[PDB]
Design a protein around this ligand. Structure first.
Ligand code: NI
Length: 341
């Protein structure tokens, strides 16, 4: 049944709650972003109002064929009224079109639902600065102190420098980047930019990217693989077998692959700096695992929460085990006692 952490008290609202059939008493279904664990259950047969960002609304219409009459896109940073309740959508610094949602309940309670987010100090200057938030529904994906990772900027610098060096040393090397969802477009777009290439990809992935309102996108991507030396493939194919196979398909245009797998966290983060990352190599194929995250590190999450000073926190991630739940609640209490709220 629908878990309590997907329901907004004092409203008929749910958040990211599309796989439970008809949720009894739900008058509006919000969708924070277009990732499958969150949209699971939507299709052209859905006949209740869906509230979301413009970009998420483009993906619902074009990829899932949800009918236009049930899609209610809202502008960001704008006070809107939904079934008699004031709401605001804020940028979540996750994937394209991902939002956080502020609810202003008729009784005076204010609730922030982060959806999935990568906390950033820039959030401390949005419409959140203007009033008190009483309850926080928090993306706790990496809520433990072992989870450190570099900035997105440092990671993209590493990838750009690595790719440019490899291809300038060998003009017959191919660059391959893995993907299995929207998000992390900077990785492949920044590499293609330094190499003076467009990124080549399947028709399905090109269609997905054409929904994202990225500026000048027609100048950066293509379905013509032969004219591109940065290829995008399914994350599944980023392994030595899958890459050897792909190289056969390019007809001796290329004699080396350099491949990137933008993982979330991996335990080489506890020891190794970004400057010091090395690939796995077999023959003329090398694979780099790079820690490009679109979720908060533990320190980024802690700074956000200690700034916001919520009265109650409701985790939305890692909630399935008692040991996880208990550990998270211990961190929340530490943070509250250190900061004095
Ligand atoms: Ni997500």
């Amino acid at each position: 049944t629908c878990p309590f952490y997907k329901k907004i008290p004092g409203t008929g609202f749910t958040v990211d709650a599309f796989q439970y059939g008809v949720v009894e008493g739900c008058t509006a279904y919000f969708l924070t972003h277009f990732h499958s664990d969150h949209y699971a259950g939507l299709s052209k047969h859905f006949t209740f109002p869906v509230y979301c960002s413009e970009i998420t609304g483009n993906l619902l219409k074009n990829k899932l064929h949800v009918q236009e009459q049930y899609i209610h896109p809202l502008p960001l940073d704008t006070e809107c009224i939904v079934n008699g309740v004031k709401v605001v959508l804020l940028d979540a610094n996750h994937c394209p079109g991902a939002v956080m949602i502020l609810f202003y309940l008729p009784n005076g309670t204010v609730i922030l639902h982060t959806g999935d987010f990568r906390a950033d100090p820039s959030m401390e200057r949005s419409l959140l600065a203007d009033q008190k938030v009483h309850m926080l529904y928090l993306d706790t994906t990496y809520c433990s102190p072992e989870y450190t990772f570099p900035s997105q900027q440092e990671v993209i610098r590493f990838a750009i420098n690595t790719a440019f060096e490899a291809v300038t040393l060998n003009p017959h090397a191919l660059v391959v980047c893995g993907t299995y969802s929207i998000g992390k477009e900077k990785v492949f777009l920044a590499i293609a930019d330094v190499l003076g290439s467009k990124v080549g990809m399947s028709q399905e992935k090109y269609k997905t990217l054409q929904c994202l309102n990225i500026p000048e996108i027609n100048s950066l991507i293509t379905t013509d693989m032969c004219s591109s030396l940065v290829h995008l493939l399914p994350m599944m194919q980023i392994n030595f077998k899958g890459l050897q196979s792909h190289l056969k398909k390019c007809g001796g245009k290329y004699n080396q692959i350099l491949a990137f797998r933008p993982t979330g966290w991996t335990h080489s983060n506890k020891f190794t700096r970004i400057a010091d990352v090395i690939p796995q190599t077999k023959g003329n194929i090398s694979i780099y695992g790079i820690p490009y995250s679109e979720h908060s590190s533990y320190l980024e999450m802690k700074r956000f929460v200690q700034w916001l000073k919520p009265q109650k926190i409701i985790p939305t991630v890692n909630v399935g085990t008692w040991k996880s739940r208990s550990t998270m609640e211990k961190y929340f209490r530490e943070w509250k006692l250190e900061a004095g709220y």
